[PDB]
Design a binder for this molecule. Sequence first.
Ligand SMILES: [Mn+2]
Ligand SMILES: [Mn+2]
Ligand SMILES: [Mn+2]
Length: 391
Amino acid sequence: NKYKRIFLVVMDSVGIGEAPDAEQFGDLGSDTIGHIAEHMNGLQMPNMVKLGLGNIREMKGISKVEKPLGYYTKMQEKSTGKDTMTGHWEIMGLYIDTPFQVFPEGFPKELLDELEEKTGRKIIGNKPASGTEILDELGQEQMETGSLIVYTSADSVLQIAAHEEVVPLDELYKICKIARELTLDEKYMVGRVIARPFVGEPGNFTRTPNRHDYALKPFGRTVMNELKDSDYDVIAIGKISDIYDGEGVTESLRTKSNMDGMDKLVDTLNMDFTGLSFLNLVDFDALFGHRRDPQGYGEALQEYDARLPEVFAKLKEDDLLLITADHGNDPIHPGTDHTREYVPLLAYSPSMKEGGQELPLRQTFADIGATVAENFGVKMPEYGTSFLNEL
Ligand SMILES: [Mn+2]
Ligand SMILES: [Mn+2]
Ligand SMILES: [Mn+2]
């Protein structure tokens, strides 16, 4: 193996400017890092700069350097959708024709009608909402009527809330499995069905730890599957395991924040493994992009950058570090949805003694999977062109 360990970091939703097909998605003008850099009056990201972020594209506070630490370029998304599953599935060697849907106006009547017909229960709510808002609004009616609170977020999810003392857990889970079958339909294609059980009384409702998720498996066997099948380590950090429904994962580390995510990356740097360490830093997307909060997003980016020098210090000669994103989510953009953007790509190993150079633009996110697969000598994915030999 050219590299004994590869650390792949997805900075979730950290896009680097509208893609060539951005207009199809109503994403003209979108620019995640660039708009944040403008809002911050110059983003402070000196370590990403040293890696060559500005060499990809110069933005306010983010300048090109003469001798970047590693190689740099950006990636274009080939799959139809701009959702998380699509992006991560593509990263790991797939092509996804059928996009996952989001529901800012609630779910179609046809879907809810069939869910009622199959469960024998009424559905109330049907809108984007946080767990707190929806329970305070409809938790009491739920208790009194035995109906299901169906809701969504800004992402591709269908959430079903029911009081544990009115609707038994096992019944909620069966109901969610029914919902999961019905949403395997391109008209209503949801990334994840989530059981949201809760307890308490009006004005004092709390969601319980008895949450269960029903995800779809990736539409094909991934590079992670092949690594795992060839006895390599695949260490998933944060929401990575969930995103792939555990496929190809040998170990999973749960995280609570971006800083916690970097702590777990550091933990894996301290592990004697051979294979892939795969982190998702989700806060950018969940807390800032979807909430159209450029200030929070800017701060989170700076907090993330400040953690990087410790990572640089722990990388060995036969380690490779990959930093990318899975789509854009421009916090100065209409609506609550993601943005169709190029993603940055930085590829760094301390073995790169004279620094890096520009890579050709990656025409699919699967170039990452392909590079990973070639490095470890496993079956190459159907999609993607490895840049391993360029490094
Ligand atoms: Mn848009
Ligand atoms: Mn994402
Ligand atoms: Mn999202």
